[PDB]
């Protein structure tokens, strides 16, 4: 091997190993394939928590100098890196963002190669910027570029410290008041000039408090998040369904809550109880009602409706009958290609908002009766798979998925 291609590929693997991310399935697959190629050709080869130090919760004296303070918000955290898709902590999966936002993020990232990744805060379909990590450019420098592209930017404070300063409660309150942000302030992260290490401060304290009941509120197009109400009527923010189940909440009981100077949040259950998640899943559903299904981290409806989604999903006008629906699809000129490049089952699944894995498991356990390229009758084969109540709810709602599938097939046949 004399050509420079092998050595370029070798530094490519070196860079990938320096910035390894197991969350990205495609990146790990390519890395494994190239590792296999190297270890077969050469017979052998040599092959975000750690970016954050220990959390501080007590007052302490600080070293005088120049620092940049940024607010950490209460919301789902995402990390975006060049060459990889969106990544959220824990699950390791990805998300869906508008193509314009992705293009803006790529334009931000490729400008400076020293930016390892960018931070995204997501809470009830709202993506905002919180912080960034770069070995050469300060986050303040790239904040102006992010604001120029139209993306929102956080509140950064550049403070020069001359004498010794104690980071006590009063100083934290002064910093919070100076920040003046309506969104919740879960922590304060400060970076010293010329220092690559990232350090964060989050005071917290615990108490016990009662809950009247747990409700759920409407957020938009079949997106719901649980809402807990207390005796005083104050709202306690909850991350997602995963946080609720891992906290092991119980109705009409006193629970331990970790409180700030402005908001109080439920915290995970660290006890040695023998409670099982599976029955908690059905208990919380029964308490909240059987008309909701768990789409992973959130709750989604079961409403019949039926015909008032293809207009919504296709972003067209309202429909009344089949013929005018066909005509309205006919006069479409741009979105029409989506019909001609994407399948029918997936289109119906997107129209009714079912999950992917759960629905695939559901359709692989029952039998149908197909006639004239259409489905007319259906029945179940094995009843064990209905152990999960959400599967039972989808089974009940299947009588509308069948109808919308039939309508989509009819319009597909009519158009071509």
């Amino acid at each position: 091997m004399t050509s420079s291609a092998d050595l370029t590929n070798l530094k490519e693997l070196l860079s990938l190993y320096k910035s390894l991310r197991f969350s990205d399935s495609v990146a790990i697959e390519k890395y494994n394939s190239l590792v296999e190629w190297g270890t077969s050709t050469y017979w052998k080869i040599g092959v975000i928590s750690d970016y954050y130090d220990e959390v501080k919760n007590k007052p302490f004296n600080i070293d005088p100098g120049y620092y940049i303070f940024l607010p950490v918000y209460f919301g789902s955290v995402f990390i975006y890196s060049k060459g990889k898709n969106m990544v959220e902590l824990g699950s390791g999966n990805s998300f869906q963002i508008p193509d314009e936002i992705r293009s803006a993020c790529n334009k931000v990232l490729d400008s400076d190669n020293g930016i390892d990744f960018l931070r995204f805060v997501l809470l009830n379909n709202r993506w905002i910027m919180e912080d960034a990590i770069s070995k050469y450019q300060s986050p303040v420098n790239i904040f102006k570029l992010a604001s120029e592209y139209g993306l929102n930017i956080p509140n950064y404070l550049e403070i020069e410290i001359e004498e010794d300063t104690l980071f006590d409660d009063e100083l934290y309150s002064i910093m919070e008041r100076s920040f003046d942000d309506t969104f919740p302030k879960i922590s304060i992260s400060y970076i010293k000039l010329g220092e690559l290490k990232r350090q964060v401060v989050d005071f917290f304290k615990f108490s016990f408090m009662y809950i009247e009941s747990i409700k759920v509120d409407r957020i938009g197009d079949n997106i719901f998040i649980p809402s807990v109400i207390t005796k005083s009527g104050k709202k306690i923010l909850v991350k997602d369904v995963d946080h609720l189940i891992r906290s092991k909440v119980r109705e009409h009981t006193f629970v331990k809550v970790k409180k700030k100077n402005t908001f109080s949040i439920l915290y995970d259950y660290d006890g040695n109880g023998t409670e099982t998640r599976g029955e908690v899943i059905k208990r919380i559903i029964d308490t909240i009602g059987r008309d909701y299904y768990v789409n992973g981290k959130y709750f989604s409806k079961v409403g019949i409706a039926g015909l008032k989604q293809l207009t919504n999903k296709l972003d067209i006008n309202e429909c009344a009958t089949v013929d005018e629906l066909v005509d309205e699809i006919n006069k479409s000129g741009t979105v029409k290609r989506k019909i001609k490049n994407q399948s029918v089952f997936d289109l119906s699944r997107e129209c009714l908002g079912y999950p992917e894995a759960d629905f695939i498991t559901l359709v692989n356990n029952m039998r149908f009766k197909i006639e004239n390229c259409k489905v007319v009758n259906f029945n179940i084969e094995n009843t064990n798979c209905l152990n999960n109540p959400s599967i039972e709810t989808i089974y009940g709602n299947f009588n509308q998925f069948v109808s919308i599938f039939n309508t989509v097939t009819d319009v597909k046949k009519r158009l071509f």
């Binding site: 399948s343 089952f345 197909i370 390229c373």
Partner: protein, 990 residues
């Protein structure tokens, strides 16, 4: 000018050529030298778009290029294949040239040479003298092979010259080495062009103190001092080592045709060359026919395991029997003695007795036609003969009769009249003979060496390597020397290229192929009822022909990940792709998420692989028919070689379709072939299992329905037969795989089983099966005990044999040569297998009756042996080889060897082989639980006497005995209980 070809070889000098060696009618040798070019196939536009003109271009005509890439589809809307029809050109370049868009890059240059010039590698040709220019004595140069080789003449017989060699060195404790161990004996068998077979042996003098040489010469041997004064007609020549090596070098340098040696590329030739170089600086030189290139011997290696080859460039073929035997077919042991056992055998009658000798007569009226002649041929140089496959005898007097032989041997009296004779192991220890060297030892070793040398010739004539080489060279379109050195991926390109040129089609892959990702067990092991064996007639080739599974006849692959789309796709599949034009085959998915995968094949136009397979099958059938109607022996050998070649080339297609870097890669076609084979096998198993013969009528277990689609044949389960009315039998199905199917009949009448098997074969072939699927009745098996097709023992009767016939003792899977088991365990396994075979024929065996008897016998015999302690120590001795090529830190064997070295003046080197056994204190009783056995291993020396304070650790040996016995038998719970009672452990089955 009429010449028959022998070998084609290449010269790897600065200017490369190609060489043809040929023989005329008289016997003279003619060499012809051709220029060798680099062949490229291009499109017309590329040919006209070459800035430097090529050396020469020849038109090829219209060709159709098809992209054979496979694309996974998730719907039923499939894009058609993209094919381009265009003019093609073949260009030749003296040196290598890079072409941007060349095609057909997976074919060798020699195949292109042969096909373009229209030359057969072994055909007889009447050459034209106009195009040949003389350059030396016996070597001509040609430049227009197309016209010089235009005329073809029928084959004519030619003489040949052969050389066979054997070497015997000196060794005392370890394997011989060049630096300290000299050569004692050399043996040579020589065949020249005149048909005279010479045979001589050279003995060293350095161990033959002067008066001893004087006496040896007085006995009749010849002593020589210089190289020039040796005559080949004298059998024994007694000379020095340097003269011996000079004679060996001179003999190896001659322009022979074949130099045949058994494992001589690793030991014999290497030792000769190394010792010759070490003693004298003079080397051995091979010269090209045109006297332009000279090379020295350097045996090189090829990895496939490691196979050693010689670097000669004079046209002689240095052939090794070891590699040919390993790759030709599978045996149990690949030793020379075992091959002689399995090759040369006969049946003889005892004509005399008395004292410690026997007289055996062997004739064609005892075993078969031709066995006696072969045994007589081997007996000329034989010294030891095996009787009953158990005893070894020394030949005293041998007389070759008119059509047989009679031999007297030294063996104890045996109460029988007809026995078995074979050539095998020799009861000779070479280590002891070298300690006290004398003339008797020298002459005996010379005889042994000459027998070893002649064994190579006998095996060469037995296996028919010459005719196989010629047939392979003709069929594969390859040189003779390259026939037995390449795998299946190389011997397939010739016929494939010919078929592609005849069909005028090219297949191109324009992507990278991703590295995408069964053992059968019989229902029971012991039978005690007759087993009928049927053989499928080339199941996979017939499946490929029937389904038309070819890379270019794949309409598509439709996959689905859920049942709704699966059902919709199935309905549209049955709607718009109807049979019999299209065939849809279900296959296992290639991805973890797909639930359904269906491949679609079109049968409107024949593919490429089915055409090749049908051509091969037709040619093999024709050659079988021609062989069955031939009377000359040479014609029979030629036809057998051709049919064997066609078989071995037609049985390699299935493996080649599933190989990533082959020229017939078709992954979907591979799955389809496997699936259809499994379906056919299961359908036959279902229809045969339970079929019975009631009155003069037969009933099956299921309808004779076609297992793929609707067919117009009769589907009545009840069939009318022609067997006698009184027969009322019930049949069973036990075992079935790709190449055979087993059936079970409950009787012990061999003639009845044979006739019913013939009737079943006729009925199955005529009615049950369909299209080109047929089966053949092979044999009948009795006393069958099997674990798989690898491991089984039974007695075999052929289809054309009556009750009063000699059985064939089939026994394989066991090695009986593993020198790390015991001397006693082998004998006990043999005794109990014999007892099982003898008792299973009684009639009342069932399932839970034999196990009790065998377990009781084992318990009683083991207890008696433990309570008697009458077995000698030499029956419990194991062996291993000492070597420091070990990983880890200790590897306790090294510690034991070092301790023995420290505690005993006798020294064990790092190449010696040492014996060891299991010795425990004499007072320890029977123990059930077991611990690390590596502690109890003790080295047994020559002077070791088992004292009264020690005994043999019997429990280990008995545990291995019971484990191997329990591997047989039917019941599991009884074996578990017995093993726990004895040793308190769980046996590891299978």
């Amino acid at each position: 000018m009429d010449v028959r070809c022998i070998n084609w070889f290449e010269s790897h000098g600065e200017n490369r050529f190609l060489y043809l060696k040929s023989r005329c009618r008289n016997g003279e040798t003619v060499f012809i030298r051709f220029p060798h070019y680099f062949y490229y196939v291009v499109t017309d536009e590329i040919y006209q778009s070459l800035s430097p003109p090529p050396f020469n271009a020849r038109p090829m005509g219209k060709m159709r290029t098809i992209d054979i890439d496979e694309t996974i589809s998730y719907n039923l809307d499939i894009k058609d294949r993209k094919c381009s029809v265009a003019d093609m050109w073949l260009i030749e370049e003296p040196k290598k040239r890079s072409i941007q868009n060349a095609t057909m890059d997976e074919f060798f240059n020699i195949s292109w040479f042969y096909i373009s010039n229209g030359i057969s590698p072994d055909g007889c040709y009447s050459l034209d003298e106009q195009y040949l220019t003389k350059i030396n004595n016996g070597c001509y140069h040609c430049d227009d092979p197309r016209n010089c080789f235009a005329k073809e003449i029928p084959r004519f017989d030619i003489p040949r010259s052969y050389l066979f060699l054997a070497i015997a060195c000196h060794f005392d404790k370890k394997f011989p080495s060049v630096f300290i161990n000299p050569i004692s004996h050399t043996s040579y068998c020589y065949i020249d062009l005149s048909g005279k077979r010479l045979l001589f042996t050279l003995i060293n003098e350095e161990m033959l103190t002067e008066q001893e040489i004087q006496e040896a010469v007085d006995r009749g041997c010849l002593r020589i001092q210089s190289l020039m004064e040796m005559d080949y007609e004298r059998e024994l020549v007694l000379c020095s080592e340097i003269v011996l090596l000079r004679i060996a070098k001179q003999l190896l340098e001659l322009t022979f045709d074949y130099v045949v040696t058994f494992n001589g590329h690793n030991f014999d030739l290497r030792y000769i060359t190394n010792r010759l170089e070490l003693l004298t600086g003079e080397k051995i030189i091979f010269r090209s026919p045109d006297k332009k290139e000279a090379v020295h011997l350097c045996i090189y290696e090829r990895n496939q395991n490691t196979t050693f080859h010689v670097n000669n460039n004079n046209g002689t073929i240095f052939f090794d029997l070891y590699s040919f035997i390993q790759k030709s077919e599978k045996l149990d042991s690949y030793k020379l003695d075992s091959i002689s056992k399995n090759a040369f055998s006969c049946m003889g009658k005892v004509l005399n007795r008395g004292v410690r000798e026997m007289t055996f007569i062997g004739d064609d009226t005892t075993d078969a036609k031709g066995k006696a002649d072969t045994f007589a041929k081997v007996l000329t140089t034989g010294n030891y003969v095996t009787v009953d496959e158990d005893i070894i005898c020394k030949v005293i007097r041998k007389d070759i009769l008119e059509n047989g032989f009679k031999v007297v041997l030294s063996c104890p009296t045996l109460p029988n009249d007809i026995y078995k004779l074979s050539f095998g192991k020799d009861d000779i220890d070479l280590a002891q003979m070298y300690k006290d060297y004398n003339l008797n030892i020298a002459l005996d070793m010379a005889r042994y060496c000459i027998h070893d040398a002649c064994l190579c010739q006998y095996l060469w004539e037995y296996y028919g390597v010459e005719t196989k080489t010629d047939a392979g060279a003709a069929t594969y379109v390859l040189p003779q020397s390259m026939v037995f050195e390449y795998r299946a991926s190389t011997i397939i390109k010739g016929p494939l290229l010919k078929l592609l040129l005849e069909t005028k089609t090219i297949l191109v892959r324009s992507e990278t192929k991703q590295k995408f990702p069964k053992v059968f067990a019989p229902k029971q092991k012991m039978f005690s009822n007759n087993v009928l064996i049927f053989d499928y007639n080339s199941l996979y080739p017939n499946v490929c022909i029937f389904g038309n599974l070819s890379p270019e006849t794949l309409v598509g692959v439709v996959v689905s990940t859920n049942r709704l789309e699966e059902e919709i796709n199935n309905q549209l599949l049955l709607q718009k792709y109807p049979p019999p034009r299209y065939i849809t085959v279900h296959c296992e998915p290639r991805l973890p998420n797909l639930i359904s995968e269906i491949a679609i094949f079109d049968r409107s136009i024949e593919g490429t692989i089915p055409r090749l397979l049908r051509t091969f099958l037709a040619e093999r059938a024709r050659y079988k028919k021609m062989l069955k109607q031939a009377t000359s022996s040479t014609e029979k050998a030629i036809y057998d070689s051709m049919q064997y070649t066609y078989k071995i080339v037609a049985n390699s297609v299935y493996g080649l379709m599933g190989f990533r870097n082959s020229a017939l890669y078709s992954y979907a076609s591979a799955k389809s072939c496997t699936s259809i084979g499994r379906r056919m096998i299961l359908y036959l198993e279902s229809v045969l299992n339970g079929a019975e013969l009631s009155n003069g009528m037969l009933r099956f277990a299921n309808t004779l329905s076609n297992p793929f689609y609707m067919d117009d044949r009769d589907i009545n389960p009840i069939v009318k037969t022609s067997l006698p009315i009184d027969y009322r039998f019930r049949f069973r199905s036990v075992y079935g795989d790709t190449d055979s199917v087993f059936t079970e009949i409950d009787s012990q009448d061999v003639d009845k089983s044979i006739e019913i098997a013939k009737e079943l074969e006729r009925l199955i072939n005529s009615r049950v099966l369909f299209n080109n699927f047929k089966i053949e009745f092979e044999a009948v098996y009795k006393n069958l005990i099997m674990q798989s097709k690898k491991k089984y023992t039974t007695m075999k009767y052929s289809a054309s044999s009556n009750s009063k016939s000699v059985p064939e003792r089939i026994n394989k899977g066991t090695s009986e040569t593993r020198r790390d088991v015991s001397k006693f365990h082998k004998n006990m396994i043999k005794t109990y297998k014999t007892r099982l075979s003898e008792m299973l024929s009684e009639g009342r065996m069932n399932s839970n009756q034999v196990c009790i008897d065998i377990l009781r016998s084992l318990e009683t015999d083991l207890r008696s042996e433990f309570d008697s302690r009458s077995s000698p120590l030499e029956l419990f001795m194991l062996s291993r080889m000492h070597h420091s090529n070990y990983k880890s830190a200790d590897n306790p064997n090294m510690y034991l060897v070092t301790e023995y070295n420290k505690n005993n003046p006798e020294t064990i080197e790092l190449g010696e082989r040492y014996y060891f056994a299991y010795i425990c204190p004499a007072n320890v009783p029977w123990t059930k639980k077991l611990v690390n056995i590596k502690t109890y291993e003790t080295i047994i020396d020559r002077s070791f006497k088992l004292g009264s304070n020690q005994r043999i650790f019997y429990e280990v040996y008995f545990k291995r005995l019971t484990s191997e016995i329990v591997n047989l038998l039917d019941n599991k719970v009884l074996c578990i209980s017995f093993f726990q009672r004895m040793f308190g452990s769980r046996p590891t089955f299978y």
